[PDB]
PDB file of C-alpha atoms and ligand atoms in Angstrom:
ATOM      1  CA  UNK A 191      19.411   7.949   0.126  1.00 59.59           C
ATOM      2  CA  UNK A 192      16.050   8.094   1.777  1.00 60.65           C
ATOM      3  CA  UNK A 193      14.779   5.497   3.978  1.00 61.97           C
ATOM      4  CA  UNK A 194      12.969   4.952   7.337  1.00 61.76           C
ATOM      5  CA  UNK A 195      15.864   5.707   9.758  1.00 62.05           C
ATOM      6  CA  UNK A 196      17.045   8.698  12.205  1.00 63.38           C
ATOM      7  CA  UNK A 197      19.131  10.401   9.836  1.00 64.61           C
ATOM      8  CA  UNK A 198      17.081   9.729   6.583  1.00 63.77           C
ATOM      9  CA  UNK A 199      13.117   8.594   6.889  1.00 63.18           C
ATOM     10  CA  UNK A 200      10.069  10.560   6.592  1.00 63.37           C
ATOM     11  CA  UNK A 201      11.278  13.613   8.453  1.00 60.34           C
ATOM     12  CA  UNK A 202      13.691  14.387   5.909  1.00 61.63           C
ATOM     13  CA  UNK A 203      11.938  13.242   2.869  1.00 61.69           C
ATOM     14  CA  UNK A 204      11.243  16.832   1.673  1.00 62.25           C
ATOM     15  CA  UNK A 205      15.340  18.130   1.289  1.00 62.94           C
ATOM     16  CA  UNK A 206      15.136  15.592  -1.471  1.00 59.42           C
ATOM     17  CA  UNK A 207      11.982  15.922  -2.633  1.00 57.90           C
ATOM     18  CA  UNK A 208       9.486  19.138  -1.776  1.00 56.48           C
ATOM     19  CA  UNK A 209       6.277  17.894  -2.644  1.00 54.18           C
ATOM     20  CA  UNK A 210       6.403  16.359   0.731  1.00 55.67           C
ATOM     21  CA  UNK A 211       5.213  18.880   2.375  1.00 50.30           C
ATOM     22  CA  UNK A 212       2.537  18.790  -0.941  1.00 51.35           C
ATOM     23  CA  UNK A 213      -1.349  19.852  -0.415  1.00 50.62           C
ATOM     24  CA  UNK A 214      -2.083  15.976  -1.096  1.00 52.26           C
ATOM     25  CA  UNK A 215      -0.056  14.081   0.687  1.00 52.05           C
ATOM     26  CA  UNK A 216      -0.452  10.741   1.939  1.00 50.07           C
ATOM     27  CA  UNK A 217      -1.131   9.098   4.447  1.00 48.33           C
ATOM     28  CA  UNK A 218      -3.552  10.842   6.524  1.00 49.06           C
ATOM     29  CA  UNK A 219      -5.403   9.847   9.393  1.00 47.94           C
ATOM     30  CA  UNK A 220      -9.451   8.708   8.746  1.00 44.67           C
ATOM     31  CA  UNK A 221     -11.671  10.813  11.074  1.00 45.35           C
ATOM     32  CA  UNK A 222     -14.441   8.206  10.542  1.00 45.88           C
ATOM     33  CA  UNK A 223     -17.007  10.894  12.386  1.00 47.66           C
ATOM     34  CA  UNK A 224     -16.016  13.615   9.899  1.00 47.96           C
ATOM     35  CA  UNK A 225     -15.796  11.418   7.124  1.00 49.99           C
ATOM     36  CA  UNK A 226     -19.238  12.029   5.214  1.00 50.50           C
ATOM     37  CA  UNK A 227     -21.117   8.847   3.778  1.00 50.03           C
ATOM     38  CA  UNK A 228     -21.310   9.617  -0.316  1.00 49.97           C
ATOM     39  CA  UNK A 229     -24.179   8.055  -1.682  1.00 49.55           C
ATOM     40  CA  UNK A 230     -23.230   8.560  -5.038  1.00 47.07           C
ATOM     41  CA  UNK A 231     -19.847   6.562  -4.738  1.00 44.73           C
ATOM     42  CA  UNK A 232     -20.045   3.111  -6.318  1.00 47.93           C
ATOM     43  CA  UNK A 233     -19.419  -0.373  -4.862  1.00 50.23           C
ATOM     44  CA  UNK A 234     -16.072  -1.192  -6.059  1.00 50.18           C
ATOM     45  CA  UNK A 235     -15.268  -3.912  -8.525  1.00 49.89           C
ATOM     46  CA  UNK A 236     -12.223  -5.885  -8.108  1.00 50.17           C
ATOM     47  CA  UNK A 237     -12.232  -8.268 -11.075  1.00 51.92           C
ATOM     48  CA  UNK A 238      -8.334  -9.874 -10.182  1.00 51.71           C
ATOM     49  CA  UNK A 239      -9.967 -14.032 -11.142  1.00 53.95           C
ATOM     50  CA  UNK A 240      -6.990 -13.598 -14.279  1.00 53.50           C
ATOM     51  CA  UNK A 241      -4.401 -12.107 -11.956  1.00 54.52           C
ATOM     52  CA  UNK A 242      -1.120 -12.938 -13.075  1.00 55.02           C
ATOM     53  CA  UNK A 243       1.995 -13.097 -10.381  1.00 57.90           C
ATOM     54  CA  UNK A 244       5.732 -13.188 -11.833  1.00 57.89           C
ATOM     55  CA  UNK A 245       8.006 -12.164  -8.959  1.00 58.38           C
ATOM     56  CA  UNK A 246       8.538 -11.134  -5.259  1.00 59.21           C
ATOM     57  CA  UNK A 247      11.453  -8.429  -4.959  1.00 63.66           C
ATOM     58  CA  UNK A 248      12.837  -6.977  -1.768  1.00 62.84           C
ATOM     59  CA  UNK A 249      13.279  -3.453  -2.887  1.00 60.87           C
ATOM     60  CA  UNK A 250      15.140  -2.141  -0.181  1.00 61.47           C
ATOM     61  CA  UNK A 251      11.927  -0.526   1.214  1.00 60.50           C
ATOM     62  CA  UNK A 252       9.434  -3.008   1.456  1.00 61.88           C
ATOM     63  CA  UNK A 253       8.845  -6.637  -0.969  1.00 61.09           C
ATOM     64  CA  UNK A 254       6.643  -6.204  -3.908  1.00 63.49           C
ATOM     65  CA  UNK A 255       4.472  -9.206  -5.579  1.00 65.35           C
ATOM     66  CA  UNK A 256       4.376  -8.154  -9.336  1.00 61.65           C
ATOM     67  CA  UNK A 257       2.194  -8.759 -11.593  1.00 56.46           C
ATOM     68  CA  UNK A 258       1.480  -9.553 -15.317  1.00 59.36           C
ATOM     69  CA  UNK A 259       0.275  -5.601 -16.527  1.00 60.57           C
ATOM     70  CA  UNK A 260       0.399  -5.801 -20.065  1.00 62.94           C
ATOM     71  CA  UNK A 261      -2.968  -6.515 -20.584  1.00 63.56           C
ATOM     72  CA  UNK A 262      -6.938  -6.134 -18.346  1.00 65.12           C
ATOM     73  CA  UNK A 263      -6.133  -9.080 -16.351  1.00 64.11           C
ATOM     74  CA  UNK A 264      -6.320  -7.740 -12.683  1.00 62.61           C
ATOM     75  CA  UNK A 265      -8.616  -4.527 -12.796  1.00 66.42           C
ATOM     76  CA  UNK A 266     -10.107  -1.984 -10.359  1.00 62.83           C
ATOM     77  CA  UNK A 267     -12.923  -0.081 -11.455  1.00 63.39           C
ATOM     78  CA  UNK A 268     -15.879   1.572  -9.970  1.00 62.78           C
ATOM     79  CA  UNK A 269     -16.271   2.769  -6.462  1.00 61.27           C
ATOM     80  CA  UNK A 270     -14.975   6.568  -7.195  1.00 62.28           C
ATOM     81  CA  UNK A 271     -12.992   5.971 -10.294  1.00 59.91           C
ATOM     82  CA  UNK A 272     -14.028   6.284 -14.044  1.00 58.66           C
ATOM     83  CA  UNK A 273     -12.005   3.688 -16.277  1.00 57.37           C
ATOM     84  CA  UNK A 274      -9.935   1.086 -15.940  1.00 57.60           C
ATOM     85  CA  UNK A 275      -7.028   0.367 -13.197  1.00 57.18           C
ATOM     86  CA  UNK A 276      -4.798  -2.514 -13.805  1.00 60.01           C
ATOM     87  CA  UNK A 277      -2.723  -4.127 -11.008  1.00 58.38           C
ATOM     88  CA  UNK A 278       1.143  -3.604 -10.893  1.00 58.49           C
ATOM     89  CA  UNK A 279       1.852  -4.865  -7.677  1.00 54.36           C
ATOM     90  CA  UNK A 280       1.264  -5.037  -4.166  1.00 56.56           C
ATOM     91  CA  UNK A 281       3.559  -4.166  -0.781  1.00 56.03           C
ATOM     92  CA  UNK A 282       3.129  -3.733   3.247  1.00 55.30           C
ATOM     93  CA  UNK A 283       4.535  -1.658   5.466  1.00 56.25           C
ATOM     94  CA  UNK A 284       4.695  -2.808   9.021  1.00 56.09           C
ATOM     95  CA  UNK A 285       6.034  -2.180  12.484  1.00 53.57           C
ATOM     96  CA  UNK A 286       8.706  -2.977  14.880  1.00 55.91           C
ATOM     97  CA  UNK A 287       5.686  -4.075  17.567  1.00 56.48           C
ATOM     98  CA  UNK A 288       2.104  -4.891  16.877  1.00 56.72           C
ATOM     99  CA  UNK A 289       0.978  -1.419  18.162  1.00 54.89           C
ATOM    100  CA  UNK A 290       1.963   0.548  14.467  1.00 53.17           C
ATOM    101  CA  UNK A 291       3.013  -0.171  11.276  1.00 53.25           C
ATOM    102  CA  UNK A 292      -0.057   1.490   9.067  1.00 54.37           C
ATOM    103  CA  UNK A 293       0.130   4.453   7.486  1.00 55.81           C
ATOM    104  CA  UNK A 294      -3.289   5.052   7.504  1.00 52.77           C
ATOM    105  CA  UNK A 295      -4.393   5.714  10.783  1.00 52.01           C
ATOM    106  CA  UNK A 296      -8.278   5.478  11.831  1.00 49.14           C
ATOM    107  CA  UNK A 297      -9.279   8.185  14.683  1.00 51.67           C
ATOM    108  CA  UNK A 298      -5.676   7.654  15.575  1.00 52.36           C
ATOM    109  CA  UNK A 299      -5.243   3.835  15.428  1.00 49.18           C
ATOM    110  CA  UNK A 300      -2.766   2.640  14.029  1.00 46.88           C
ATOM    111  CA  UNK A 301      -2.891  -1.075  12.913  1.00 46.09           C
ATOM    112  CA  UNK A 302      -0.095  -3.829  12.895  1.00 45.72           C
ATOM    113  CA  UNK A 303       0.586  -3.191   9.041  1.00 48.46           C
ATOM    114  CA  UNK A 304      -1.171  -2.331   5.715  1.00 48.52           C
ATOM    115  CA  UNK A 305      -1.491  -3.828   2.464  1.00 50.15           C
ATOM    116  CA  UNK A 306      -1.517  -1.469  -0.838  1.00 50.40           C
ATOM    117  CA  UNK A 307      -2.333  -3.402  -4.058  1.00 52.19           C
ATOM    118  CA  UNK A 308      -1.407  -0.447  -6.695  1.00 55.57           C
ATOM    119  CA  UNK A 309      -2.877  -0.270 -10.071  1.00 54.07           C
ATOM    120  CA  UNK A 310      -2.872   2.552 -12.795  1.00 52.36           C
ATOM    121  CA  UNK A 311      -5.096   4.378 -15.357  1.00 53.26           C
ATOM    122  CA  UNK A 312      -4.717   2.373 -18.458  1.00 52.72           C
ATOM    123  CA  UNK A 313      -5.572   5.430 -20.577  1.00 51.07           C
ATOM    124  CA  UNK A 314      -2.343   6.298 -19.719  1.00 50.03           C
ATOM    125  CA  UNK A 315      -0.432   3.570 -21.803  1.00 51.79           C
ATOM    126  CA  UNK A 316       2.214   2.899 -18.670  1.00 50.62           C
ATOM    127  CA  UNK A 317       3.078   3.304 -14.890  1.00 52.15           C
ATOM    128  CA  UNK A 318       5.039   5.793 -15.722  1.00 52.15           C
ATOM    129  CA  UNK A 319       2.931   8.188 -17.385  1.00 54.90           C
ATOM    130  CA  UNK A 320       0.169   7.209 -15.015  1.00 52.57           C
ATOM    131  CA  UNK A 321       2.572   8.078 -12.435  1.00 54.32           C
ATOM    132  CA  UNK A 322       2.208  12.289 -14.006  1.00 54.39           C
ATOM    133  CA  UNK A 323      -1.543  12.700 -13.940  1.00 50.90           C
ATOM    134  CA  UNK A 324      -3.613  13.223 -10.719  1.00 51.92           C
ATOM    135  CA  UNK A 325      -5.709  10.357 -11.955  1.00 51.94           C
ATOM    136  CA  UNK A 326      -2.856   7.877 -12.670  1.00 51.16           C
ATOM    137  CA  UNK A 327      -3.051   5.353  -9.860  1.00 50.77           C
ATOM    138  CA  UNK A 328      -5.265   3.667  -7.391  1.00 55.49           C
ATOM    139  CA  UNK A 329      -4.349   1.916  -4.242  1.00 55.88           C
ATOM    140  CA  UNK A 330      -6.682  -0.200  -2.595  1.00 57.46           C
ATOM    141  CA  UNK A 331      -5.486   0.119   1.169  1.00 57.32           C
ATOM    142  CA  UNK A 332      -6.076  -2.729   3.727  1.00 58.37           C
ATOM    143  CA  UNK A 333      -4.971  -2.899   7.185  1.00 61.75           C
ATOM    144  CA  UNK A 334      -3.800  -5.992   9.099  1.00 60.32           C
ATOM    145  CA  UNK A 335      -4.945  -6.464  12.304  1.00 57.58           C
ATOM    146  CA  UNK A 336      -3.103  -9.549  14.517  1.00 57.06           C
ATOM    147  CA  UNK A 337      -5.579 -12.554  15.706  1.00 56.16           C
ATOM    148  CA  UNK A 338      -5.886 -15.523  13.436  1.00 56.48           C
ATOM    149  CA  UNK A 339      -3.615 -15.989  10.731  1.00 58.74           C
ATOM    150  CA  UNK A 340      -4.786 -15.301   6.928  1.00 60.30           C
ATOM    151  CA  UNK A 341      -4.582 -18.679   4.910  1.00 63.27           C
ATOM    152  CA  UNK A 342      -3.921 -16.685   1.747  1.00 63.61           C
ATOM    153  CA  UNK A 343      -1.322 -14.840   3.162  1.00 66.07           C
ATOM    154  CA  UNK A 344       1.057 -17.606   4.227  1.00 63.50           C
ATOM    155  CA  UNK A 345       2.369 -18.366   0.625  1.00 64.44           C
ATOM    156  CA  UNK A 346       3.993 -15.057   0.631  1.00 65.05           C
ATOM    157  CA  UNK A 347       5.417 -15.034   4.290  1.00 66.73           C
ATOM    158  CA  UNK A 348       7.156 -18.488   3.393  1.00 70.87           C
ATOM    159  CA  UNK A 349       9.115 -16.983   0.187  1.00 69.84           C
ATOM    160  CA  UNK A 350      10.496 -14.240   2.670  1.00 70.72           C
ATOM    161  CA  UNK A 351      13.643 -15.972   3.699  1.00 70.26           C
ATOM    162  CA  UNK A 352      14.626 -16.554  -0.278  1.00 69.97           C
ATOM    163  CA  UNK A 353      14.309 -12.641  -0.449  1.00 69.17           C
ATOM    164  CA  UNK A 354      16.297 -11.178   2.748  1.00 68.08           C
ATOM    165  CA  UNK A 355      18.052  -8.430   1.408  1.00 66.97           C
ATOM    166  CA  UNK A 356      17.884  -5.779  -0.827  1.00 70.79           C
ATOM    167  CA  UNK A 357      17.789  -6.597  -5.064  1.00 69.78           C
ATOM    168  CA  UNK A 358      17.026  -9.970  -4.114  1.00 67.90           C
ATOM    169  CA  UNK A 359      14.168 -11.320  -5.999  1.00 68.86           C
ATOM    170  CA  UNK A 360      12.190 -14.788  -6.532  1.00 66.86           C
ATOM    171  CA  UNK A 361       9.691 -16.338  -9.047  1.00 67.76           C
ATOM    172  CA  UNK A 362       6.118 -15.700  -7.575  1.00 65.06           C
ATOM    173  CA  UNK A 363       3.670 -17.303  -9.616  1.00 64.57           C
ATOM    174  CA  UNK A 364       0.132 -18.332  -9.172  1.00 65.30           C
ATOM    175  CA  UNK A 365      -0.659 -16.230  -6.159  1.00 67.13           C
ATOM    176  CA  UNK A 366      -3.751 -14.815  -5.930  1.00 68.02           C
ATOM    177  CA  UNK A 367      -4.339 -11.949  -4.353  1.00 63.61           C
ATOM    178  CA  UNK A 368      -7.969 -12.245  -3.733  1.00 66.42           C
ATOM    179  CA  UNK A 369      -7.028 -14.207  -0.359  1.00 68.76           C
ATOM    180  CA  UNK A 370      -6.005 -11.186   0.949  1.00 66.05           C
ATOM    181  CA  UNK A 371      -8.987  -9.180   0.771  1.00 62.76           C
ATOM    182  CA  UNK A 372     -11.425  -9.025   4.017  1.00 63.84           C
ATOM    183  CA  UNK A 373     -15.326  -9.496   3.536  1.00 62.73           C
ATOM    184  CA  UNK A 374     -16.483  -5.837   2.655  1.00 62.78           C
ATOM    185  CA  UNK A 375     -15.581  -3.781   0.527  1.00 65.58           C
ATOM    186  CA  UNK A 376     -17.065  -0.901   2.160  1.00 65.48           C
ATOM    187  CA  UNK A 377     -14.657   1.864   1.943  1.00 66.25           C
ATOM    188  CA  UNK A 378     -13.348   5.456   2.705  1.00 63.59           C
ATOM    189  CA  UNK A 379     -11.845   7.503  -0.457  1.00 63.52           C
ATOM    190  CA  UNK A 380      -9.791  10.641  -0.691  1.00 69.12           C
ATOM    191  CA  UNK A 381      -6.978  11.756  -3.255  1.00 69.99           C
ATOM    192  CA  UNK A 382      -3.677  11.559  -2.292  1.00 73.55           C
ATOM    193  CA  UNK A 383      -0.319  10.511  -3.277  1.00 75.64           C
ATOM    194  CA  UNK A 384       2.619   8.172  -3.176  1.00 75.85           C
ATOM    195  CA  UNK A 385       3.723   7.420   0.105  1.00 73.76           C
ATOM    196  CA  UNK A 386       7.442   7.276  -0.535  1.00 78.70           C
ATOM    197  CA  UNK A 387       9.569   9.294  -2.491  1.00 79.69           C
ATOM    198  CA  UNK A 388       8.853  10.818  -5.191  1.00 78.88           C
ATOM    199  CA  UNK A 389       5.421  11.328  -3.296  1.00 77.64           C
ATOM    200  CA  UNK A 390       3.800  12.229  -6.428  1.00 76.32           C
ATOM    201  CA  UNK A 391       0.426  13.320  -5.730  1.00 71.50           C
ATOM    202  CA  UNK A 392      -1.097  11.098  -8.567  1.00 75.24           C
ATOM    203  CA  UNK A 393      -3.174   8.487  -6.158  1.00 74.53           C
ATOM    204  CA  UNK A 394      -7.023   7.820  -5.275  1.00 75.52           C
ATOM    205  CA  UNK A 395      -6.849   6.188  -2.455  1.00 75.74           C
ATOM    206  CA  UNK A 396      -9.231   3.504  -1.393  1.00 77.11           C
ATOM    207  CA  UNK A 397      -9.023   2.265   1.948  1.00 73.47           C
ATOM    208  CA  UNK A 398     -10.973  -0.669   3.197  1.00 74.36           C
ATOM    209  CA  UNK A 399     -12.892  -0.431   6.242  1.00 74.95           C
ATOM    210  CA  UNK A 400     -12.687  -4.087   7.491  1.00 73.96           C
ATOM    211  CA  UNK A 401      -9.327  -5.346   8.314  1.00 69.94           C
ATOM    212  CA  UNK A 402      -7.695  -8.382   7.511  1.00 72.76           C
ATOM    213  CA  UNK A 403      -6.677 -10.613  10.213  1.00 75.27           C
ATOM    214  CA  UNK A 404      -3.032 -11.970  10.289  1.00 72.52           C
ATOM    215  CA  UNK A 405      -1.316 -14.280  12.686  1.00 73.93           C
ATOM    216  CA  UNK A 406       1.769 -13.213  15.169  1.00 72.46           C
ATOM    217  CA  UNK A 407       3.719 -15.521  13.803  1.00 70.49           C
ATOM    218  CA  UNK A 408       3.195 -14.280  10.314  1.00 69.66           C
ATOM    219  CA  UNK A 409       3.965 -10.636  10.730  1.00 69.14           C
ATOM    220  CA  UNK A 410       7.028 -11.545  12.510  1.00 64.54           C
ATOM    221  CA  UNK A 411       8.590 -12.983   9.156  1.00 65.87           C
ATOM    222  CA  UNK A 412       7.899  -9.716   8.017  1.00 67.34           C
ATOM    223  CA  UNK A 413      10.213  -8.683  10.638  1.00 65.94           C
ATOM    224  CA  UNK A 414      12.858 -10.827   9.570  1.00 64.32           C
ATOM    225  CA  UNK A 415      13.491  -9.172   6.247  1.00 63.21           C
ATOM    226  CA  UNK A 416      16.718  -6.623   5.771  1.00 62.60           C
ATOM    227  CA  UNK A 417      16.890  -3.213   4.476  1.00 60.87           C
ATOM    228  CA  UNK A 418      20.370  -3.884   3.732  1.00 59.40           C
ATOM    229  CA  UNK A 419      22.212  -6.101   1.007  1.00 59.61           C
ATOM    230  CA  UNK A 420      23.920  -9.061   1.445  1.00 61.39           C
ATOM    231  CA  UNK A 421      26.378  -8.849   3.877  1.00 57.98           C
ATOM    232  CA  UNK A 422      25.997  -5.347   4.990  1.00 56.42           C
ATOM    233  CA  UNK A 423      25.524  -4.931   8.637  1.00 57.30           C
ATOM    234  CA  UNK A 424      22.041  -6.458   9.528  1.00 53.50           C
ATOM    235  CA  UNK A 425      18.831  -3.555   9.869  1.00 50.05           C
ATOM    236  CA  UNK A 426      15.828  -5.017  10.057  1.00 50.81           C
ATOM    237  CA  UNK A 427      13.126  -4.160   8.241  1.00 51.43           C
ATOM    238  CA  UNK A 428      10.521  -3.260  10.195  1.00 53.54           C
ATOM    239  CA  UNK A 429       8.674   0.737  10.897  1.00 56.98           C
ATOM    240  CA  UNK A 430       8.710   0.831   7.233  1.00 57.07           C
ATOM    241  CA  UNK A 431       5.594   3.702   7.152  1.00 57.74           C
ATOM    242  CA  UNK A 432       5.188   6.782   6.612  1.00 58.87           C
ATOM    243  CA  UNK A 433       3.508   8.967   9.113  1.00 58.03           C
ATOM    244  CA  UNK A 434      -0.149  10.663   8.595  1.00 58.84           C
ATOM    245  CA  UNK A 435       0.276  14.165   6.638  1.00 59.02           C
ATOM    246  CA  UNK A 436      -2.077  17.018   7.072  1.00 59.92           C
ATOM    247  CA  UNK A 437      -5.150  16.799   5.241  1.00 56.80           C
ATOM    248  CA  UNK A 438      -5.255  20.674   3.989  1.00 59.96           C
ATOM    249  CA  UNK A 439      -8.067  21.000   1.803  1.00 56.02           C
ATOM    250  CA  UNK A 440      -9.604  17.404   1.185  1.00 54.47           C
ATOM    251  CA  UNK A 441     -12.389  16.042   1.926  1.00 53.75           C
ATOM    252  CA  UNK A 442     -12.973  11.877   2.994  1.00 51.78           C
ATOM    253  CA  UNK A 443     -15.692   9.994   1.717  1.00 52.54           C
ATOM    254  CA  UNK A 444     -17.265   7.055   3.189  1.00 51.22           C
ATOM    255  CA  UNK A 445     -19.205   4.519   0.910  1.00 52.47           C
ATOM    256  CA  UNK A 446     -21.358   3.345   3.956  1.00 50.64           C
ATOM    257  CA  UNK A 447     -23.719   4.514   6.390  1.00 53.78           C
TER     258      UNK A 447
HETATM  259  C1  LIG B 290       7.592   4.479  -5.863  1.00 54.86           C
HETATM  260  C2  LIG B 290       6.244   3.848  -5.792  1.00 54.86           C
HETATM  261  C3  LIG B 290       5.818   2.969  -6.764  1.00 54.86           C
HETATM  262  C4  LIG B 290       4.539   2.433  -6.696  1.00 54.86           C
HETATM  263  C5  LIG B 290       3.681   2.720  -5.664  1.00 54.86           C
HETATM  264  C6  LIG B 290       4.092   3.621  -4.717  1.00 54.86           C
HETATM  265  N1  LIG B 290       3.238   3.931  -3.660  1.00 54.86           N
HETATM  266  O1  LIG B 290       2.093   3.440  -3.432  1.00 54.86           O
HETATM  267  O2  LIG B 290       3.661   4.810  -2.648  1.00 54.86           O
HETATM  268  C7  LIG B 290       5.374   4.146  -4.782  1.00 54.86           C
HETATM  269 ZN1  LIG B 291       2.660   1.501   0.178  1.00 54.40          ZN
END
């Protein structure tokens, strides 16, 4: 099945799954000169003071912190959405070397990994349905550069070696994900999809502008995670991303000058 190897990552994506090579697919790379500053886009509002954690799973792909999403407790609104987005989980995806990793790229840059918190249109009842609309999800994308380490990030990188391999999981409470945002919330916006399979093209993406700043040390635990399951031959997990897609007809919006 897919993954991010030679004989089954991003490349080959589309045998399984055509929308790949979909008129909104994601990631893309953020001409920031082309990019045109919207005044009428709103600040964002990320209300996530209730957030609820449960669990940290190594999916196979990446690790996912889930969240409580049965009720408003950790909601995106504003900035280009209308309604109410309510926080599922959040991932990475990261690189084999400091010099990739994001999928976003920014006039070409790629940072040392990126964060996506995902959330999804509650007038859509569940992920799931959200999941069929072109309106279901948002992802709030933030990319890690590597200088200092992030405080707030080092709860999660110590759980990593309780979650090595694929179906593992842990309990993950009482993490808060607001010590993973940077300063500003400035932001570029364009719509977009999943980026890995089934690449539905359900997203608005919201990328920060401002990375985060995490230690060496830190992404390197990230490093030490396994694609595999227990005791299958050891692959690393690491160059986890998906590649920047052609933008085809869309348009980026900044929400600065
Ligand atoms: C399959 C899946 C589930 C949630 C989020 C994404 N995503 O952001 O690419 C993908
Ligand atoms: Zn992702």
């Amino acid at each position: 099945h897919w993954g991010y190897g030679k004989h089954n990552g991003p490349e080959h994506w589309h045998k399984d799954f055509p929308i790949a090579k979909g008129e909104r697919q994601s990631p893309v790379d953020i001409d920031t000169h082309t990019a045109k500053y919207d005044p009428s886009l709103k600040p964002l509002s990320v209300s996530y003071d209730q957030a609820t954690s449960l669990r940290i799973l190594n999916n196979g792909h990446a690790f996912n912190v889930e969240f409580d999403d049965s009720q408003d407790k950790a909601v995106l609104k504003g900035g280009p959405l209308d309604g109410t987005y309510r926080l599922i989980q959040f991932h990475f995806h990261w690189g084999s070397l400091d010099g990739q990793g994001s999928e976003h790229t920014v006039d070409k840059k790629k940072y040392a990994a990126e964060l996506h918190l995902v959330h999804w249109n509650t007038k859509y009842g569940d992920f799931g349905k959200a999941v069929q609309q072109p309106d279901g999800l948002a992802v709030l994308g933030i990319f890690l550069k590597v200088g200092s380490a992030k405080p707030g990030l080092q709860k999660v990188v110590d759980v990593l070696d309780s979650i090595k391999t694929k179906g593992k999981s842990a309990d993950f409470t009482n993490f808060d994900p607001r010590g993973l945002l940077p300063e500003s919330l400035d932001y570029w916006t364009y719509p977009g999809s999943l980026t890995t399979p089934p690449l539905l093209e359900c997203v608005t993406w919201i990328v920060l502008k401002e990375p985060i700043s995490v230690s060496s040390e830190q992404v390197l635990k990230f490093r030490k995670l396994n694609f595999n399951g227990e005791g299958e031959p050891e692959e690393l997990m690491v160059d986890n991303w998906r590649p920047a897609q052609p933008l085809k007809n869309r348009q980026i919006k900044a929400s600065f000058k």
